Design an enzyme around this catalytic site. Structure first.
Site, PDB file in Angstrom:
ATOM      1  N   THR B   1      51.003  96.384  -0.256  1.00 39.04           N
ATOM      2  CA  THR B   1      51.277  95.008   0.241  1.00 39.04           C
ATOM      3  C   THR B   1      52.611  95.002   0.982  1.00 39.04           C
ATOM      4  O   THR B   1      53.579  95.625   0.545  1.00 39.04           O
ATOM      5  CB  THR B   1      51.306  93.998  -0.912  1.00 39.04           C
ATOM      6  OG1 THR B   1      49.965  93.846  -1.383  1.00 39.04           O
ATOM      7  CG2 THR B   1      51.797  92.617  -0.455  1.00 39.04           C
ATOM      8  N   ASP B  17      50.598  91.049   5.234  1.00 38.32           N
ATOM      9  CA  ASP B  17      49.394  91.781   5.618  1.00 38.32           C
ATOM     10  C   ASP B  17      48.212  91.219   4.825  1.00 38.32           C
ATOM     11  O   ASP B  17      48.388  90.309   4.014  1.00 38.32           O
ATOM     12  CB  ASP B  17      49.550  93.287   5.379  1.00 38.32           C
ATOM     13  CG  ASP B  17      49.402  93.668   3.920  1.00 38.32           C
ATOM     14  OD1 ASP B  17      50.182  93.157   3.089  1.00 38.32           O
ATOM     15  OD2 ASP B  17      48.504  94.477   3.601  1.00 38.32           O
ATOM     16  N   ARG B  19      45.605  93.340   3.230  1.00 38.06           N
ATOM     17  CA  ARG B  19      44.903  94.377   2.468  1.00 38.06           C
ATOM     18  C   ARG B  19      45.088  94.211   0.960  1.00 38.06           C
ATOM     19  O   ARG B  19      46.204  94.027   0.479  1.00 38.06           O
ATOM     20  CB  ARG B  19      45.365  95.777   2.885  1.00 38.06           C
ATOM     21  CG  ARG B  19      44.676  96.898   2.116  1.00 38.06           C
ATOM     22  CD  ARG B  19      45.121  98.277   2.572  1.00 38.06           C
ATOM     23  NE  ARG B  19      44.532  98.658   3.854  1.00 38.06           N
ATOM     24  CZ  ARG B  19      44.712  99.835   4.453  1.00 38.06           C
ATOM     25  NH1 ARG B  19      45.471 100.772   3.894  1.00 38.06           N
ATOM     26  NH2 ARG B  19      44.128 100.078   5.620  1.00 38.06           N
ATOM     27  N   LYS B  33      47.242  86.325   1.453  1.00 40.60           N
ATOM     28  CA  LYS B  33      48.402  86.475   0.568  1.00 40.60           C
ATOM     29  C   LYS B  33      49.443  85.365   0.723  1.00 40.60           C
ATOM     30  O   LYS B  33      50.399  85.308  -0.052  1.00 40.60           O
ATOM     31  CB  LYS B  33      49.065  87.831   0.801  1.00 40.60           C
ATOM     32  CG  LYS B  33      48.110  89.003   0.668  1.00 40.60           C
ATOM     33  CD  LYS B  33      48.841  90.332   0.739  1.00 40.60           C
ATOM     34  CE  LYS B  33      47.863  91.483   0.895  1.00 40.60           C
ATOM     35  NZ  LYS B  33      48.539  92.800   0.774  1.00 40.60           N
ATOM     36  N   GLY B  47      51.815  92.273  -5.690  1.00 38.93           N
ATOM     37  CA  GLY B  47      51.586  92.727  -7.060  1.00 38.93           C
ATOM     38  C   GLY B  47      50.152  92.489  -7.488  1.00 38.93           C
ATOM     39  O   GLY B  47      49.221  92.840  -6.764  1.00 38.93           O
ATOM     40  N   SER B 129      54.733  97.283  -1.620  1.00 33.54           N
ATOM     41  CA  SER B 129      54.753  98.731  -1.397  1.00 33.54           C
ATOM     42  C   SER B 129      55.210  99.098   0.017  1.00 33.54           C
ATOM     43  O   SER B 129      55.772 100.175   0.234  1.00 33.54           O
ATOM     44  CB  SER B 129      53.370  99.329  -1.670  1.00 33.54           C
ATOM     45  OG  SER B 129      52.378  98.694  -0.883  1.00 33.54           O
ATOM     46  N   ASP B 166      52.542 102.203   5.572  1.00 32.85           N
ATOM     47  CA  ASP B 166      52.239 102.116   4.139  1.00 32.85           C
ATOM     48  C   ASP B 166      50.727 102.081   3.920  1.00 32.85           C
ATOM     49  O   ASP B 166      50.029 101.243   4.492  1.00 32.85           O
ATOM     50  CB  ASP B 166      52.893 100.872   3.520  1.00 32.85           C
ATOM     51  CG  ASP B 166      52.517 100.667   2.057  1.00 32.85           C
ATOM     52  OD1 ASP B 166      52.401 101.662   1.313  1.00 32.85           O
ATOM     53  OD2 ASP B 166      52.335  99.500   1.650  1.00 32.85           O
ATOM     54  N   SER B 169      49.186  98.888   2.500  1.00 29.00           N
ATOM     55  CA  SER B 169      49.081  97.728   3.388  1.00 29.00           C
ATOM     56  C   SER B 169      48.210  98.046   4.598  1.00 29.00           C
ATOM     57  O   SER B 169      48.094  99.204   5.002  1.00 29.00           O
ATOM     58  CB  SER B 169      50.468  97.293   3.860  1.00 29.00           C
ATOM     59  OG  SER B 169      51.357  97.138   2.770  1.00 29.00           O
TER      60      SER B 169
HETATM   61  B1  LIG Z   1      49.645  94.257  -2.726  1.00 26.08           B
HETATM   62  O1  LIG Z   1      49.351  95.657  -2.730  1.00 26.08           O
HETATM   63  O2  LIG Z   1      50.732  93.997  -3.633  1.00 26.08           O
HETATM   64  C1  LIG Z   1      48.409  93.452  -3.159  1.00 26.08           C
HETATM   65  C2  LIG Z   1      48.763  91.985  -3.032  1.00 26.08           C
HETATM   66  C3  LIG Z   1      47.725  91.114  -3.768  1.00 26.08           C
HETATM   67  C4  LIG Z   1      48.382  89.771  -4.119  1.00 26.08           C
HETATM   68  C5  LIG Z   1      46.470  90.883  -2.909  1.00 26.08           C
HETATM   69  N1  LIG Z   1      48.024  93.811  -4.535  1.00 26.08           N
HETATM   70  C6  LIG Z   1      46.867  94.441  -4.793  1.00 26.08           C
HETATM   71  O3  LIG Z   1      46.045  94.759  -3.936  1.00 26.08           O
HETATM   72  C7  LIG Z   1      46.581  94.727  -6.266  1.00 26.08           C
HETATM   73  C8  LIG Z   1      47.068  96.110  -6.626  1.00 26.08           C
HETATM   74  C9  LIG Z   1      46.913  96.247  -8.019  1.00 26.08           C
HETATM   75  C10 LIG Z   1      45.934  97.090  -8.550  1.00 26.08           C
HETATM   76  C11 LIG Z   1      45.792  97.223  -9.931  1.00 26.08           C
HETATM   77  C12 LIG Z   1      46.629  96.519 -10.793  1.00 26.08           C
HETATM   78  C13 LIG Z   1      47.607  95.679 -10.271  1.00 26.08           C
HETATM   79  C14 LIG Z   1      47.751  95.547  -8.892  1.00 26.08           C
HETATM   80  N2  LIG Z   1      45.126  94.631  -6.414  1.00 26.08           N
HETATM   81  C15 LIG Z   1      44.549  93.608  -7.071  1.00 26.08           C
HETATM   82  O4  LIG Z   1      45.176  92.705  -7.623  1.00 26.08           O
HETATM   83  C16 LIG Z   1      43.159  93.607  -7.094  1.00 26.08           C
HETATM   84  C17 LIG Z   1      42.427  94.794  -7.109  1.00 26.08           C
HETATM   85  N3  LIG Z   1      41.029  94.752  -7.127  1.00 26.08           N
HETATM   86  C18 LIG Z   1      40.376  93.514  -7.137  1.00 26.08           C
HETATM   87  C19 LIG Z   1      41.127  92.345  -7.125  1.00 26.08           C
HETATM   88  N4  LIG Z   1      42.525  92.422  -7.102  1.00 26.08           N
END
Ligand SMILES: *[B]([O])([O])[C]([C][C]([C])[C])[N]C(=O)[C]([C]C1=[C][C]=[C][C]=[C]1)[N]C(=O)C1=[C]N=[C][C]=N1
Ligand SMILES: *[B]([O])([O])[C]([C][C]([C])[C])[N]C(=O)[C]([C]C1=[C][C]=[C][C]=[C]1)[N]C(=O)C1=[C]N=[C][C]=N1
Ligand SMILES: [Cl-]
Ligand SMILES: [Cl-]
Ligand SMILES: [Mg+2]
Ligand SMILES: [Mg+2]
Ligand SMILES: [Mg+2]
Ligand SMILES: [Mg+2]
EC number: 3.4.25.1
Lengths: 241, 226, 244, 196, 250, 243, 231, 204
Positions: B1, B17, B19, B33, B47, B129, B166, B169
């Protein structure tokens, strides 16, 4: 006739305990007045020390709730201090939770809601006080908001409370009918205090010494009470014109 | 992210972003986001996705009730205070890393929030990240007295640095501009530099390609009359 | 202390009656009449709205007939606000049973549960009872079509035809006269409306002063359909039976 | 983190670096670690940012409520409220706080509250990871009843060295001066203090 | 201490009357007149701003209140009781609905929640009933426009148009003659102003009258752009000037 | 009528008759006084000798709170003890959190709010005591008097109990004749006299004198009882004045 | 009259009738005497029987090795209060390795009885107590009333016809206080004191109850043929 | 040990032209042991369809929970819940168990009855909403399903064409996963008709 003992409806749709709490408000026989300037809000109240054995410095019905908010009470001192302590706690908690100073009108509403609960819940009695909150709000500017034992509250251009409130109220009403504005058009707070004292003298028809009055002043970012010597200076200026 | 916040002359801009990932897999290519706490208070979240959404909705809900209670437009410091105290109480277990921005009667504001409840003040901020890639751009091109146009450009460039460099992202750039004395403009998919190329082949199958065992109508309607 | 102001809502009279239950029943006797008639091929629920106004929005209004689930409905007589508290509790109970056993709740079990809640307010807690009487119309695969009633005492009984609210004495006499065991829904519809038409305190019985519902197996094959009648549909059935 | 508070003739001065780190990444290079709990009672924060902020916010609330009832609190009272929070929640907190304030009666006072939640009243105090590298320097160079200019130079030179050797310390040197005259904020940039 | 009033203060009398509810309705009768009228493309709610003193700023006291972006409320009876009910009504709209379904509740269900709160004050221990009758106007996608009355008992009824408080008997008669199912919103506002003039003694203008509508979506009042599906609140409070303009064509 | 049967009920006057009835219990009690002096305060009380079987100097009435506050009261003695116990809890929690000993005005409000809370509900009875208290803090000497309603003010001199009018008259003379102030040792002598003069209202039974004081110079700002030679000196001075 | 329904109600003259009615229960109770010298403290109690077949109700209760009391009024209330004293004496010993002062024991009883006079729902204690003890400041005698009032005395008596014994002790004050290092003579004075409260009935072997505590004398109760010596 | 892969199974959803499709396998196992080949993972409340992968006890529990809630919704609202609203209800319900979650991968599919717009959504075990335009995947062969969907899918497919695409996506993904397969079901959903088709597949 137990509908007159606790806060339940009478056949007329009335709450007698609330009405009798309004009557307790005048037990002190003190009159208060609040007016707004351009940059300030001034509140004055009669000070009566009947006993010579009393320490006159401790005899007060004006309270510093927060740095910005001041409160004058009409009613017995125990209930006044009850309300003062609660308002101080509420104002402090508000700042901690929401990250900014509690506005005068918001505190008034909060205390009014607490009062409303006493009119609806049987085990709690109403407080026999009328609370006049004053400040210079950062959004609304000079502010006067008053609460009563019914849980009613409203903003004011100016206001008066006590046994002779009507005489003061009409005096203020007639002034604002002439000027056609919602405040005292004056730069300094000193002159706004002089206006407040002058119009109380005219309304009540009594002269005041330095120890007969009690004054509170709200400016931007602080509320403060005047000393006997500060009031004396105020009384001198009134007499010299 | 990659999420960023940039102050400018008469307001503040935030960007992000789109992703979302679960390990090395992309869960969502066009994730949103940027969250609305109130009409003119928005925040970007990094997160754990459910946490950033939930904590924003809760505080946004309470902010709305607070605004109605006080008859005032909500302040960024109120959202900040309510978010940090909520996150602190949960000792970092609520994985929300937020950039909180907005305009209110006090002025324009920009803050960051970390999961354990610590807050920071700044003219430019980045989280996630891809924050190192974004902060490299911000540290190289940021200046005082930025215009609205310059701040959007700088913010989106910072997100792009995250998108390209990254692996956490990617995809698109979302933006929200909050200017003083104006409606906040939410620019969903402000940039789209990652459209997939046309496929070489169409994989549409001939009808009857799949083997079927049974067929039946499913009753979705209610119990019928007569 | 507080004892001074306590009415003591859960005590016996010297005669062995529950004061508040009796007075709650007196309240219900002034409520709009509700009638339930059980037939071999369905159940009818008819009820009279109390002195309405021309400016009342009828098509979106509901004060008498409520749906508990797809198989069970109730007619209300008494304080509507009290009834809605109990109705929402009954709806939840039905769903709890369905979640637990994966089967629709039997009518009597639902009735007993609500009736037990009412009973509790007469024995403990020091609160006033619910000023509500229900007519339960429902179906299950054990007993088929069933009519029950409950009152503020928490006592419930089963019926072939029954009335609650105002003029129940006059209404029950008329039902007892014309009711027969081999009766059908269409006939029961007519009996219900005719009984209301004679017992009503109003000058004439019209569509705007009524709520009407049926629970029929008249649904495509072995299943049960609930029909809450619309204002126009009540107007049509009034013409059909020859009342207006 | 490199923080210090130094009493002097006219009152007390608080000093701090501006670096916040997540491991070796500098999450904030312009952090303000000198925080206000009352008009003329401030504190230097070290350890967990979240913890010390939460603590400081609670203390500010307590002293605001104290003021509304009993008037201006003493620096000792402020230190006691910090202590109560730090001591009773020692298992769950990572906070090294220096409390500094100015009364008219008591003048400049400094109280240091390390990890355990103990309280120590001192003429001056140093804390944070970078303080280790200036125990020798500060002990040799500190004098009681210094002037404002001397105290500023003492803090500037001390924190300069702490920054030079400690990776967790850096950025600008912030300072807050507490006297009868009022509250003054000072800032010193790398180009100034590095050449010392 | 402890709240030792764990028993009901509202009980059935020998005649079957719930005294405290009847007395609460009497308090509502003494209250200032308020009304509601439903049009084809909107709803209007209105009341008199009975100022307790000319020194009092009547703008600070809001008798007509936003509950949700598409739902508004007005009352007759005890003002303080109304104020706390609005606070609870706003909160319950979030806790019991929006935080679950991600959208604001439909009018009838919010009314149902408010009704529940008022019913509980009629049965729970150590409390009196609320001394107010509410008129709640609102809009939602599937039910369209609607207007509801809520009484101290907790009972609620939907209305095409109605009035409560001081001169409700006369006001309801006036509305029966004027109301039809083809009214536009402007026609309903006109009728609302005519009806309200009869119950008012003194000054009759934008500063002494409080009036709000549930009508078309107001994208200008939303506060942000960029989401097509968010088109703004249907609740709008009419300004002092907007009222006076319609009093010239009266 | 019936408004006086339950606490926390407003009469049509706006009065709480139950609190006014509690005042009658106070008026029935023995005389107790307080005198504010130059750098401290002096407390004195009338102890009625009901019988010869009472052990002299044992049934102590004046109570200390913390180490700097003195408390004396007239009316129902157990109610006063209950109030002082609460005062001690309040003072302990203040010192626990804020380190410094509780200021006298701060302490006065703690008692005031607690007594006032016993006028808010019918499930409790008001306090049947008027309490005179005070001491020395950072801002100097303070004397207070607290009523059953929760009402309290600061005083130059204070008196309560059956001989309050006689005492008040004597206190008023001291205020007029000593505008520059009264010393601590003088106040002890005057306190003894006033109790002896106030004893004319309880002249049937003989009594025992009990005095205490807090003074910045004489007691280092700590509460102490007047004992031995200094007590006898005050008794002799008092006996000389009545004759 | 209208103000005696509960303990939470003052009368118009500032009286608490429920407390006064509780005080009345003590006057109905059997007489008990307390007195002390500088070395010893003595309790003497006239026990009461239901009839000739019944036993004589016990009046004296031990609280610690150095402290105990005699009761007059509702006996179960004396059991509750004596149990509380036992616990408080015991807390002082276990936590502070300190024998509880008799004066402090009186303060604890006062405060416990007080809470029952100010709160709704409860009732005042319906018993009076005479506490004797020997602590670090010598011999002590206390009188407890359920109003909360506790008083340290040289000698006293409570119960029916207690005024006669109280007058005797008021005359004998100068004599019995001087009885130091002589337990039997101090008891004699107590037995002679309680005799002034007797009418019709006299002190028999199973009627009389005596207790003593002193310098080198633990709190001990004498009943039966152990008190025949003093008859 | 890992709760999400004890029982096995998969769900996939796709949008088409004025239609949506949702499909699932039929396997329920205890790690290596195949137990049941009739364990359907797709349920429906009115016109809203819900597929759930993951721990089978939670699959059953959540179905019963959402039946419970959608039935109460309907009684109070006097209308069937819509896919957009139901999606929020699923998210709310999952997040209330934030620190003691149901170990599931829900998938919502349906057509809004008023607007006629096709709708699909996916969730993680704690409530996060993935509202995709094209497709949603869930279960032990989610990697495989992503690969199949991302290559085979094209927008605006007709109902009968969409059936072929989603079926091939499921079948070929399942055949590369040990804990998925043992039969498959495909729902084709149009505004006022729904067709259910059981697929013939390899039974190993
Ligand atoms: B970013 O990478 O911080 C992103 C922002 C989020 C608010 C959309 N986070 C994620 O993509 C997180 C990463 C993650 C994975 C595992 C544990 C904690 C965090 N992913 C998720 O929250 C996620 C993953 N799969 C389905 C739904 N949500
Ligand atoms: B300093 O290094 O102690 C500093 C003081 C803080 C109040 C701003 N602390 C930190 O930078 C801590 C980590 C740490 C480093 C060295 C010693 C002790 C602790 N950092 C954080 O608390 C932090 C980092 N990134 C985001 C949020 N919080
Ligand atoms: Cl509130
Ligand atoms: Cl920080
Ligand atoms: Mg009340
Ligand atoms: Mg460094
Ligand atoms: Mg396989
Ligand atoms: Mg196999």
């Amino acid at each position: 006739g137990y509908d007159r003992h606790i806060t339940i409806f009478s056949p007329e749709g009335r709450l007698y305990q609330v009405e009798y709490a309004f009557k307790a408000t005048n037990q002190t026989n003190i009159n208060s007045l609040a007016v707004r300037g351009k940059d300030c809000t001034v509140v004055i109240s009669q000070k009566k020390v009947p006993d010579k054995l009393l320490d006159p410095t401790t005899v007060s019905y004006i309270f510093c709730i927060s740095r910005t908010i001041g409160m004058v009470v009409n009613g017995p001192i125990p209930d006044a201090r009850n309300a003062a302590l609660r308002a101080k706690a509420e104002a402090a908690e508000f700042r901690y939770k929401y990250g900014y100073d509690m506005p005068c009108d918001v505190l008034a509403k909060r205390m009014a809601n607490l009062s409303q609960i006493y009119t609806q819940r049987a085990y709690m009695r109403p407080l026999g006080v009328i609370l006049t909150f004053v400040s210079v709000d950062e959004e609304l500017g000079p502010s006067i908001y008053k609460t009563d034992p019914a849980g009613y509250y409203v903003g004011y251009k100016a206001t008066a409370t006590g046994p002779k409130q009507q005489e003061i109220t009409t005096n203020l009403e007639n002034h604002f009918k002439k000027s056609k504005i919602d405040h005292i058009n004056e730069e300094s707070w000193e002159k706004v205090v002089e206006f407040a004292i002058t119009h109380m003298i005219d309304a009540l028809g009594t002269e005041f010494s330095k120890n007969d009055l009690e004054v509170g002043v709200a400016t931007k970012d602080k509320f403060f009470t005047l000393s006997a010597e500060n009031i004396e200076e105020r009384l001198v200026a009134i007499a010299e014109q | 992210t990659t999420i960023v916040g940039v102050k400018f002359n008469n307001g503040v801009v935030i960007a992000a972003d789109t992703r979302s990932t679960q390990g090395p897999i992309v869960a969502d290519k066009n994730c949103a986001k940027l969250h609305r706490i109130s009409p003119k208070i928005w925040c970007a979240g990094a997160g754990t996705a459910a946490d950033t959404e939930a904590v924003t909705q809760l505080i946004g809900s309470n902010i709305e009730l607070h605004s109605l209670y006080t008859s005032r437009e909500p302040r960024v410091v109120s959202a900040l205070q309510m978010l940090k105290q909520h996150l602190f109480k949960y000792q970092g277990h609520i994985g929300a890393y937020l950039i909180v921005a907005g305009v209110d009667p006090t002025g324009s504001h920009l803050f960051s929030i970390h999961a354990h409840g610590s807050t920071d003040v700044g003219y430019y901020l980045s989280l996630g990240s891809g924050s190192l890639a974004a902060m490299a751009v911000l540290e190289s091109h940021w200046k005082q007295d930025l215009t609205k146009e310059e701040a959007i450009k700088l913010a989106s460039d910072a997100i792009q640095a995250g998108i390209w460099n990254d692996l956490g992202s990617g995809s698109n750039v979302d933006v929200c501009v909050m200017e003083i004395g104006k409606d906040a403009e939410y620019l969903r998919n402000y940039l789209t530099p990652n459209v997939r190329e046309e496929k070489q082949k169409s994989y549409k199958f001939p009808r009857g390609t799949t083997a079927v065992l049974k067929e039946s109508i499913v009753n979705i309607c209610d119990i019928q009359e007569e | 202390g507080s004892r001074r102001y306590d009415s003591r809502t859960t005590i016996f009279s010297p005669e062995g009656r529950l004061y508040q239950v009796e007075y709650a029943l007196e309240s219900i006797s002034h409520a709009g009449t509700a009638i339930g008639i059980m037939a071999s091929d369905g159940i009818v629920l008819a009820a009279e709205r109390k002195v309405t106004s021309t400016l009342l929005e009828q098509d979106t209004s509901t004060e008498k007939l409520y749906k508990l689930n797809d198989k069970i409905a109730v007619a209300v007589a008494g304080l509507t606000a009290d009834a809605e508290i109990l109705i929402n509790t009954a709806r939840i109970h039905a769903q709890n049973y369905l979640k637990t056993y994966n089967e629709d709740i039997p009518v009597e079990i639902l009735v007993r549960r609500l009736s037990d809640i009412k009973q509790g307010y007469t024995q403990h807690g020091g609160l006033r009872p619910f000023g509500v009487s229900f007519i339960y119309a429902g179906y299950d695969d054990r007993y088929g079509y069933q009519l029950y009633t409950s009152n503020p005492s928490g006592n419930y009984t089963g019926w072939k035809a029954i009335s609650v609210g105002a003029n129940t004495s006059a209404a029950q006499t008329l039902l007892q006269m014309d009711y027969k065991d081999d009766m059908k829904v269409d006939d029961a519809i007519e009996l219900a409306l005719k009984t209301l038409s004679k017992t009503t305190d109003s000058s004439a019985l019209t569509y705007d002063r009524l709520e009407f519902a049926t629970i029929r197996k008249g649904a495509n094959d072995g299943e049960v359909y609930q029909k809450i009648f619309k204002p126009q549909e009540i107007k049509d059935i009034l013409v059909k039976t020859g009342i207006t | 983190t490199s923080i210090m508070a130094v009493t002097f003739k006219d009152g007390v001065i608080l000093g701090a670096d501006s670096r916040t780190t997540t491991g070796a990444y500098i999450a904030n290079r312009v952090t303000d670690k000198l925080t206000r709990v009352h008009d003329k009672i401030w504190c230097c924060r070290s350890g967990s940012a979240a913890d010390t902020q939460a603590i400081a916010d609670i203390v500010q609330y307590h002293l605001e409520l104290y003021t509304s009832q009993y008037g201006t609190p003493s620096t000792e009272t402020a230190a006691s409220v910090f202590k109560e929070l730090c001591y009773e929640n020692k298992d769950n907190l990572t906070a090294g706080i220096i409390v500094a304030g100015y009364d008219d009666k008591n003048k400049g006072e400094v109280y240091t509250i390390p990890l355990g939640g103990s309280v120590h009243k001192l003429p001056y105090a140093i804390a944070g990871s970078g303080s280790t590298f200036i125990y020798g320097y500060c002990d040799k160079n500190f004098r009681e009843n210094m002037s404002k200019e001397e105290t500023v130079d003492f803090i500037k030179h001390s924190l300069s060295q702490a920054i030079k050797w400690d990776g967790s310390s850096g950025g600008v040197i912030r300072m807050v001066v507490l006297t009868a005259a009022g509250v003054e904020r000072l800032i010193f940039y790398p180009d100034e203090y590095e050449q010392l | 201490m402890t709240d030792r009033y764990s028993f009901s203060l509202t009980t059935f009398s020998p005649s079957g009357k719930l005294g405290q509810i009847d007395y609460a309705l009497t308090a509502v009768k003494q209250g200032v007149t308020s009304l509601g009228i439903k049009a084809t493309n909107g709803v209007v709610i209105a009341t008199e701003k009975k100022s307790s003193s000319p020194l009092a700023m009547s703008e600070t006291l809001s008798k007509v209140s936003l509950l949700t972006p598409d739902i508004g409320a007005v009352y007759s009876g005890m003002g303080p009781d109304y104020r706390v009910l609005v606070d609870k009504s706003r909160k319950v709209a979030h806790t019991s609905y929006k935080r679950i379904y991600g959208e604001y509740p439909p009018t009838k269900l919010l009314v149902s929640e408010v009704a529940k709160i008022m019913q509980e004050a009629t049965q729970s221990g150590g409390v009196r009933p609320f001394g107010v009758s509410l008129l709640i106007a609102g809009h939602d996608e599937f039910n369209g426009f609607s207007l509801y009355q809520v009484d101290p008992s907790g009972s609620y009824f939907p209305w095409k148009a109605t009035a409560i408080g001081k001169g409700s008997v006369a006001a309801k008669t006036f509305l029966e003659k004027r109301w039809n199912d083809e009214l536009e919103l402007e026609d309903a506002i006109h009728i609302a102003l005519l009806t309200l003039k009869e119950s008012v003694e003194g000054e009759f203008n934008g500063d002494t009258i409080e009036l709000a509508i549930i009508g078309d979506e107001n994208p200008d009042l939303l506060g942000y752009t960029g989401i097509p599906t968010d088109k703004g609140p249907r609740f709008r409070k009419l300004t002092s000037q907007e009222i006076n303009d319609r009093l010239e064509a009266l | 009528t019936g408004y006086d049967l339950s606490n926390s009920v407003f009469s049509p006057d706006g009065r709480n008759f139950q609190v006014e009835y509690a005042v009658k219990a106070v008026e029935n009690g023995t005389t107790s006084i307080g005198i504010k002096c130059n750098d401290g305060v002096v407390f004195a009380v009338e102890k009625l000798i009901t019988s010869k079987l009472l052990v002299p100097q044992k049934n102590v009435k004046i109570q200390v709170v913390d180490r700097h506050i003195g408390c004396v009261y007239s009316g129902l003695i157990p109610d006063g003890r209950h109030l002082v116990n609460r005062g001690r809890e309040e003072a302990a929690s203040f010192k626990k959190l804020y380190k410094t000993p509780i200021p006298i005005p701060a302490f006065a409000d703690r008692l005031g709010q607690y007594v006032q809370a016993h006028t808010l509900y019918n499930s409790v009875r008001p306090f049947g005591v008027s309490t005179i208290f005070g001491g020395v803090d950072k801002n100097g000497a303070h004397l207070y008097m607290l009523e059953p309603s929760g009402s309290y003010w600061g005083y130059k001199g204070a008196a309560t109990g059956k001989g309050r009018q006689s005492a008040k008259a004597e206190l008023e003379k001291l205020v007029d004749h000593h505008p520059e102030g009264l010393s601590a040792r003088e106040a002890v002598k005057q306190a003894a006299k006033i109790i002896y003069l106030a004893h004319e209202d309880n002249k049937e039974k003989d009594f025992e004198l009990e005095i205490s004081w807090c003074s910045l110079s004489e007691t280092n700002g700590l509460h102490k009882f007047v004992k031995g030679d200094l007590l006898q000196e005050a008794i002799d001075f008092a006996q000389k004045e009545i004759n | 009259n209208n103000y005696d329904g509960d303990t939470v109600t003052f009368s118009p003259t500032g009286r608490l009738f429920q407390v006064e009615y509780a005080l009345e229960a003590i006057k109905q109770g059997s007489v008990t005497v307390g007195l002390r010298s500088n070395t010893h403290a003595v309790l003497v109690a006239l026990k009461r029987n239901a009839d000739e077949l019944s036993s004589y109700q016990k009046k004296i209760i031990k609280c610690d090795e150095h402290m105990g009391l005699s009761l007059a009024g509702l006996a179960p209330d004396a059991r509750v209060l004596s149990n509380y004293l036992r616990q408080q004496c015991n807390y002082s010993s276990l936590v502070f390795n300190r024998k509880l002062a008799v004066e402090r024991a009186g303060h604890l009883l006062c405060d416990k009885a007080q809470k029952n006079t100010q709160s709704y729902g409860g009732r005042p204690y319906g018993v009076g107590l005479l506490i004797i003890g020997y602590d670090k400041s010598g011999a002590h005698l206390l009188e407890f009333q359920p109003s909360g009032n506790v008083t340290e005395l040289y000698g006293t008596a409570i119960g029916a016809r207690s005024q006669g014994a109280k007058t005797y002790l008021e005359r004998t004050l100068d004599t019995f206080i001087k009885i130091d290092g002589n337990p039997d003579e101090l008891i004699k004075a107590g037995v002679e004191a309680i005799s002034q409260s007797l009418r019709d009935e006299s002190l028999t072997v199973d009627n009389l109850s005596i207790a003593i505590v002193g310098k080198d004398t633990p709190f001990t109760i004498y009943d039966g043929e152990a008190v025949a010596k003093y008859i | 040990s890992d709760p999400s892969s004890i029982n096995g199974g998969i769900v996939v959803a796709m949008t088409g032209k004025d239609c949506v499709a949702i499909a699932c396998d039929l396997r329920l196992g205890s790690q290596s042991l195949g137990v049941s080949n009739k364990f359907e993972k797709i349920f429906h409340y009115g016109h809203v369809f819900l597929g759930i992968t993951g721990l089978a006890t939670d699959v059953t529990t959540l179905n019963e929970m959402f039946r419970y809630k959608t039935n109460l919704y309907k009684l109070k609202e006097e209308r069937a819940i819509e896919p957009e609203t139901f999606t929020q209800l699923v998210s709310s319900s999952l997040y209330e168990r934030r620190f003691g979650p149901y170990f599931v991968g829900p998938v919502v599919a349906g057509i809004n009855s008023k607007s006629g717009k096709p709708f699909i959504a996916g969730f993680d075990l704690i409530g996060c909403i993935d509202e995709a335009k094209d497709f949603i995947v869930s279960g032990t062969a989610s990697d495989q399903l992503f690969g199949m969907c991302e290559s085979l899918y094209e927008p605006n497919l007709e109902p009968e064409d969409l059936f072929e695409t989603i079926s091939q996506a499921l079948l070929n993904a399942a055949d590369r996963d040990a804990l998925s397969g043992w039969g498959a079901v495909v729902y084709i959903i149009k505004k006022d008709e729904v067709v259910k088709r059981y697929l013939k597949m390899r039974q190993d």
